Amino acid sequence: NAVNIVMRQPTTPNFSSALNITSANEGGSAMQIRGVEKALGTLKITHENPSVDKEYDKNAAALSIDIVKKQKGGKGTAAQGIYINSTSGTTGKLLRIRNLNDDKFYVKPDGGFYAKETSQIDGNLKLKDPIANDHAATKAYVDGEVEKLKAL
């Protein structure tokens, strides 16, 4: 590697990081990365459990994002967490989530999603009237069928 940074194991765990980056310039990205990989991530992050115990790292993550107001006097913020785009257009999955090398959840380049297991919304779902037999029925579709039976 052109540059390698290593933080060795300390005597006792502490809050220090191998690399810390701060910018006070509002007009540019604090950090940028560009690469040209054939078959890998431009940025690869790996979290490894420090412990043999399979629950030890329940509160850890590979990537943690926080979105905050101005420290002194701030009235709030409207900043976004993660923004993904393709200014050229891609035919690849925009977001692809796996576990044990199996596709679990993804977002297609058209915005349609796939979830591998039973899911929950604590609210309503607005969508189009069903075409196929395995499409979700709308209240309209149901009420239209009921109207025809009520007529006879």
Added chain:
Amino acid sequence: NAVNIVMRQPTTPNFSSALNITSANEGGSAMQIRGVEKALGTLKITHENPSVDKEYDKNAAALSIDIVKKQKGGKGTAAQGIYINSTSGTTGKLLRIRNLNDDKFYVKPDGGFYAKETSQIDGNLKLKDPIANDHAATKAYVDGEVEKLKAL
């Protein structure tokens, strides 16, 4: 911290970054990170509003991703935005989104998702026939009930 990089506030905002990384090697990741956190992110990103005004940073994000074709002559790209996996298998949430420390949207390790509020698909939803009373009805399920009433 082992290494600290600081960009101070400039007289006028400009496009400069504290750290910029570029690779022209197609065979490896431009950047890699590995850590062993018990209870934190391997990479932590924090966006802070530069202004007291709660709408000032509406177009900002913590993480921005772009996916582009080869600059000169490129016919397109099939690269993915974000790819998440667990080669060991994890029992943690694969994607976990909160606001004000409250779970808003997540993807479970099995691929099932949870959304806290009313959602919208500008299309159809393909899914399984309902088992529970609070499961979404399919067109099949509705049409099966209607068939029995039409019979009598």
Added chain:
Amino acid sequence: NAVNIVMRQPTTPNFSSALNITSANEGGSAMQIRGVEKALGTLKITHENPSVDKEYDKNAAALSIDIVKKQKGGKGTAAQGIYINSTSGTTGKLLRIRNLNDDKFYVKPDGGFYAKETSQIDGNLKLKDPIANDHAATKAYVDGEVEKLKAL
């Protein structure tokens, strides 16, 4: 830029990275970034296809995340992939996915999502009974209408 790191094109592709970061300290983030952008990402990642051929980079991504157990003897892991929060509260989209500059999929600050095209769940969807005509019908809602017809 305050710091620029460049890996030039090698004679033959290889696994080397421009920047590689490793920490063995369980008590702190291997890397942290903080910025104050008005209208950009704190971290910006760009993947560019190395080739003119629009399928050449089908297995590449801008961001790749892996979640692993302790290398020797580990029993498993419970770590999360991506964790997003706003300790201040934001009114911005928490996750916003586009292709060709058009909104394809997003998560609102309340946890409600939007998908632009037909989607699939390989399971059931638990949700609330419909209010509007374009809301998905539950099994309860359907069965309630059928009960009234069965009565007459």
